[PDB]
């Protein structure tokens, strides 16, 4: 577990969404399931996601990175969208299974 | 007889048609009957 | 067979009658409705009525709807200020699946924010559809004027609350009013042990005797709506009696003596006293019926009149004068007997259908905790004496009046003038 | 110069004061309003107030608007339940043009169908903007509850009539209620002969009293909105003396004694008896005032309370108890003297501005014909005795009361309880 | 006659519809809150 966690942390730091202040779910591709999951998000989380994304986009516009103190830590990264996305994918899978037979 | 349906003058029989979710509501004798014969 | 009436230890009544019919109907009657609501949570009952198909812990909304359609069954919620009924109907073979769905709906509701937010729009559409008949608006305003609290609450969500009903309020309503002691499970076409098994499987968790609303207080006020419709719909009512009392039966007999809803299509309602009394004075189109609403803690009796705007006052006063006539003692024994016959036939015809029998059994179980055979109800009906009908008419005449009228109120009378 | 009052043979009243000021204000006051609307034509007065710029026989809408703007003038219509006032303000040099426009608007309306249809939308916008403040709806419902007749009619068109007001109805209202006997032309900064000339020029036609509205009849009803607003607005009123009567002056003195409005910004309203009587009981934000509205046929006096939903009953009961205390005779001579000082200063300050003086002159001319100098009004105020105020409070306490409340209304008392 | 008539005026030029009601309070409500 510790070895897998170390490699995962290495990948997390190697990817730069932490540097821009973004969390992992902020970087997910907005497919239809992800769009519905975002639609279902509570207002506070949706607004926090919107501001984080806007700040990241502004930083990339000026080709800058957030100060190292403000980088998102691997421990504190919270997968807010994952439960809603899981529920959405479960509903889609149920509908597809019903369609199959 | 312990229901507003006991009064059959029309308990407002205001239910809406539906399938797998049809909500209905009733109040009590509502008149509106036999006035329809004349505009 | 015969109806099997059992009170489980938790307080849940399960009643089953095996009619050996192709279709089985099972309905859960809950003692929750507009009455069991306060100013803060007004309109929750309406959204609960519209929220039957929403996701539950056991099954998703997709599963509920698709499965109920797949078996061809129907899930319906019928709401009354004092009661809310969830009824599932399907063929005898597939009853168990719909029972699982129904118990999931009633006992394990997951009011997810997005799904509840979606349903908020349906409240306005449902209210618009219901209010297309003006008598619904008239009756809602009548209940508002008659009672200060409890029964005054409308069966439809108030407009200011159309989009502001919260999932937390629905959870609170379900938890504090959907309780075992306030529930009755009545099934036609199913065995008693199966119903007991289902009730034990699902409804057991909720504790009985939940939050109880305040006793209804009689406001005795007038609510008038000027909407410009050509026909004025007005109802003058007074506090009559609670359901199950002898005075309630006397008031029902009075309702049929004065004239309940018409019998002959395109008929003149000749036997109805109110219709003839109004016709003698008013020769324009008109409609007059006796309004009797009986609720657990109180009841309303009065005259409902639909009339042309100019002649509305004449119709209202003439019907009131006929009721006064009855109060003064001008009641024939033959008319009382005819009213009794009509009442008994009405009860029998109401219980004729599967839906009627299910509703009646559930209402009796909730109101009284027991089932009365139709013969006993008929014996109660014939027990009524003419003097009691006259006394009920006296109570209506003397009592404080609450009136609600809608239309070109214009020449419509006020309660004080009446 | 001094105010000049002339009653013409046609019945129109012309008044002018030459203030020798840079601006001249000319106003035509007509005894028309919501009071004179019947049920069929409800809301016509609202559209007539809005339809002051529509095409007239003399001038088009384009001409009226562009010209009044070109001279920098203003055309304003102010409507009360018993009155409508058309006023034009501009520099003295250009007064003739705006006077011609105003007389064209008042006496030669065309009410073309397309423009009337266009203006019907503005009814909803005006009603919505006015109803942003809860006091507007609270007072409209208060007048509806208090009176069963003309005075109940709202100053804003009923919603069902928003698009149903017809050009024929506007023509009928103008013809039967815009008449010389009901009109007064009051001018500030304009010489009397010029006003007389213009009045001869345009107001010669449509003479006579015109259609007469029925006397207002007290209804003693309650209307409860239940709009879910955080703060409950409640008014409790009882019938009072008509305008220009001794009991009316006594009621005004009583209104000031109980407490009318703040005199010191962000102050505790120490002089106001109601405010501190309520304040001792209730420590939450609250507001209380005396409602005195006097009309020719009758008037209403009572208490208007803005309070938190939970504490509405405490506020209302405390204000009513203070009024009862005044009725019981616990009124000091010093309090009456202070109220008289406040009332006289209020009248003088109200007439200080040109708009206020024009409004006062028009109101006096329409209600009582002649103009009474401010000294006479102050003497009338002085004449009122303490016993008169006590008797007015006794009349309020004894009389049948009407209540209109808006808000959560869960704890707002009903009229019977109060 | 009205202390606080709160006459619901409408902002306007060349056409200003103003309607007047009787004393309706709200004068000191802003003192505490709303």
What number of other Cβ atoms are within 10 A of residue D369's Cβ?
Answer: 11
What phi-psi label fits residue E23: left (phi over 0), alpha (psi between -120 and 50 degrees) or beta?
Answer: beta
Task: For strands D83-91 and D222-224, give the pairing.
Answer: unpaired
- Do the chains contact at A98 and C62, CB–CB below 8 Å? yes
**Residue C233 · residue B31 · CB < 8 Å:** yes
Helices (H) and strands (E) in chain D, counts: 14, 11
The secondary structure of residue D56, as a DSSP letter, is B
What token pair was written down for B3?
Answer: 């229901």
Q: Is the Cβ pair E25, D306 closer than 8 Å?
A: yes
3-class state of residue D293 by DSSP = strand
Q: Cα(D378)–Cα(D359) distance, rounded to whole angstroms?
A: 18
Cβ distance C135 to B31 less than 8 Å, yes or no, reads yes
Report d(CA D129, CA C41) in Å as an integer.
Answer: 28
CA distances from A5 to A8, A9, A36, A75, C98 (A): 5, 6, 31, 11, 48
Q: Chain E residue closest to D342 (CA)?
A: E3
Exp. method: cryo-EM
**Pairing state of beta strands E16-19 and D74-80?**
parallel
Phi, psi of C290 (to 5 degrees): -90, 130
Q: State both tokens at C317.
A: 């006063």
For the beta carbon of residue C162, count every other beta carbon within 10 angstroms.
18
CA A89 – CA A95 distance, rounded (Å): 10
> What are the Cα distances from residue C331, in Å, to C273, C343, C387?
10, 17, 9
| 8 Å CB contact of C164 and D228 | yes
Contacts of D371 (CB under 8 A, 6+ apart): D3, D5, D15, D361, D364, D365
Q: How far apart are the first and last CA of chain B?
A: 35
> Nearest CA to D111 among D162, D158, D165?
D165
Distance between CA atoms of residues C382 and D340, nearest Å: 72
Phi/psi for D28 (5° steps) reads -100, 115
What values do phi and psi take at C109, rounded to 5? Answer: -90, 130
Q: What's the DSSP call for residue D122? A: H
Cα(C109)–Cα(C122) distance, rounded to whole angstroms? 19
Best B13, B25, B35, B37 member to test C by mutation, with max C CBs in 10 Å, is: B25
Strands C13-17 and C183-188: parallel
Q: How many helices (H) and strands (E) does chain A have?
A: 4, 0
Q: Which of A40, A94, A98 sits opposite C114 (nearest CB)?
A: A40
Q: Contact D79/E17, CB-based, under 8 Å?
A: yes
Q: Nearest CA to D377 among D355, D357, D393? A: D357
Distance CA C49, CA B25 (A): 9
Q: How far is the C-alpha of D219 from the C-alpha of C56, rounded, in Å?
A: 52
Parallel, antiparallel, or unpaired for β D23-30 and D183-188? antiparallel
CB count in 10 Å sphere of residue C266: 9
Q: With CA atoms as reference, report the closest residue to D29 among D258, D203, D155, D148.
A: D203
**D254 and D392 in contact (C-beta within 8 Å)?**
yes
Neighbours of C358 (CB within 10 A): 24
Our CA dihedral for D391, D395, D396, D398, rounded to 10 degrees, sits at 130
Q: Which of C222, C227, C228 sits opposite D221 (nearest CB)?
A: C222
Dist CA D168 CA D178 (whole Å)? 15
Q: Please give the DSSP secondary-structure letter assigned to residue C205.
A: G
Reference C357, options D108, D417, B1, D364; nearest CA is: B1
**What gap in Å lies between CA C378 and CA C387, rounded to an integer?**
19
**b/e map of D92-129 (b: 16 or more CB within 10 Å)?**
bebbbbbbbbbbbbbbebbbeeebbeebbebbeebbeb
For C303-331, the DSSP string reads: EEEEEETTTHHHHHHHHHHHHHHHHTT--
> Residue C265: is it exposed, middle or buried by C-beta count within 10 angstroms (0-12/13-18/19+)?
exposed
User: Could you tell me the CA-to-CA distances from D111 to C233, D28, D44 in Å, in that order?
Assistant: 34, 19, 12
The DSSP H or E segment spanning C28 is strand C23-30
> b or e along D319-348 (b: 16 or more beta carbons within 10 Å of the residue's beta carbon)?
bbebbeebbeeebeeebbeebbebbbebbe
Q: Residue C14: left if φ>0, alpha if ψ -120 to 50, beta else—which one?
A: beta
Dihedrals φ, ψ of D254, to 5°? Answer: -65, -40
Q: Which residue has the tokens 């200003």?
A: E16
Determine the Cα angle at D117 with ends D116 and D122, to 5°.
85
Tokens at D267, concatenated: 């102050």
Q: In 3D, which of D27, D313, D388, D402 has the Cα closest to residue D187?
A: D27
Half-sphere exposure of D242 (CA within 13 A, CB side): 11
Candidates C275, C112, C175; CA nearest to B35 is C275
Q: Which tokens in the block code for residue A17?
A: 């969404």
Q: If interface means Cβ-Cβ distance under 8 Å, which residues of chain E face chain D?
A: 1-4, 6-8, 10, 12-29, 31-34
- Kindly determine whether residue C60 and residue A91, on different chains, have CB atoms separated by under 8 Å: yes
Phi, psi of C55 (to 5 degrees): -60, 140
Question: With an 8 Å Cβ cutoff, is C130 touching chain B?
Answer: yes
Q: How far apart are CA C247 and CA C12, in angstroms?
A: 29
Q: Which residues, listed in sequence order, are joined to residue D302 by a DSSP beta bridge?
A: D237, D291
- Quote the CA–CA distance of C305 and C278 in Å, as a whole number: 10
Q: How far apart are CA D325 and CA D265, in angstroms?
A: 28
């Amino acid at each position: 577990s510790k070895w897998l966690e170390g490699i995962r942390k290495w990948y997390y730091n190697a990817a730069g969404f932490n540097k821009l202040g973004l969390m992992r779910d902020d970087t997910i591709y907005e497919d239809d399931d992800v769009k519905e999951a975002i639609r279902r998000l509570p207002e506070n989380l949706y607004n926090d996601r919107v501001f984080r994304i806007k700040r990241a986009l502004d930083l990339t516009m000026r080709q800058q990175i957030l100060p190292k103190e403000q980088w998102t830590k691997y421990e504190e990264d919270k997968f807010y969208l994952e439960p809603y996305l899981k529920e959405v994918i479960r509903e889609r899978k149920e509908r597809e299974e019903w369609a199959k037979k | 007889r312990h229901v507003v349906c006991r009064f059959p003058l029309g308990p407002f029989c205001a239910g809406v048609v539906g399938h797998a979710a049809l909500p209905a509501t009733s109040e009590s004798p509502v008149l509106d009957a036999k006035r329809s014969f004349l505009c | 067979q015969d109806l099997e009436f059992t009170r489980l230890p938790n307080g849940l009544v399960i009643a089953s009658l095996e009619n050996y019919a192709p279709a089985s109907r099972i309905g859960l009657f809950i003692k929750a409705g507009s009455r069991y609501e306060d100013s803060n949570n007004l309109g929750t009952s309406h959204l609960l009525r519209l929220a039957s198909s929403l996701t539950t812990k056991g099954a998703s909304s997709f599963k509920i709807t698709r499965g109920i359609e797949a078996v061809g069954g129907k899930l319906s919620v019928t709401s009354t200020r004092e009661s809310m009924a969830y009824t599932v109907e399907c063929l005898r073979d597939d009853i168990e699946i719909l029972m699982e769905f129904l118990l999931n709906v009633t006992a394990a509701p997951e009011f997810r924010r997005w799904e509840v937010a979606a349903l908020q729009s349906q409240l306005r559409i449902d209210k618009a559809v219901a209010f297309q008949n003006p008598q619904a608006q008239v009756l809602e305003n009548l209940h508002a004027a008659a009672y200060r609290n409890a029964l005054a609450n409308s069966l439809y969500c108030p407009d200011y609350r159309i989009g502001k009903v919260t999932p937390d309020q629905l959870h609170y309503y379900v938890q504090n009013h959907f309780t075992s002691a306030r529930m009755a499970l009545i099934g036609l076409g199913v065995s008693h042990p199966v119903l007991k098994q289902v009730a034990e499987r699902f409804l057991n968790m909720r504790g009985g005797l939940g939050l109880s609303g305040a006793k209804a207080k009689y406001r005795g006020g007038e609510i008038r709506d000027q909407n410009g419709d050509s026909l004025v719909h007005a109802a003058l009512v007074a506090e009559s009696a609670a359901t199950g009392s002898a005075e309630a039966n006397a008031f029902s007999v009075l309702q049929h003596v004065l004239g309940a809803g018409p019998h002959v299509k395109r008929g003149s309602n000749a036997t109805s006293s109110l219709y003839q009394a109004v016709a003698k004075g008013v020769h324009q189109p008109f409609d007059v019926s006796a309004f009797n609403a009986s609720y657990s803690d109180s009841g309303l009796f009065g005259i409902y009149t639909i009339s042309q705007a100019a002649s509305a006052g004449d119709v209202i006063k003439s019907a009131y004068d006929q009721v006064k006539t009855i109060a003064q003692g001008n009641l024939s024994n033959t008319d009382v007997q005819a009213a009794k016959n009509k009442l008994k036939a009405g009860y029998l015809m109401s219980v004729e259908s599967s839906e009627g029998f299910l509703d009646e059994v559930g209402s009796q179980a909730l109101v009284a905790g027991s089932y009365v055979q139709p013969s006993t109800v008929l014996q109660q009906i014939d027990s009524v004496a003419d003097a009691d009908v006259i006394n009920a008419a006296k109570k209506f005449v003397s009592g404080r009046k609450s009136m609600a009228a809608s239309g070109n109120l214009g020449h419509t009378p006020f309660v004080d003038e009446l």
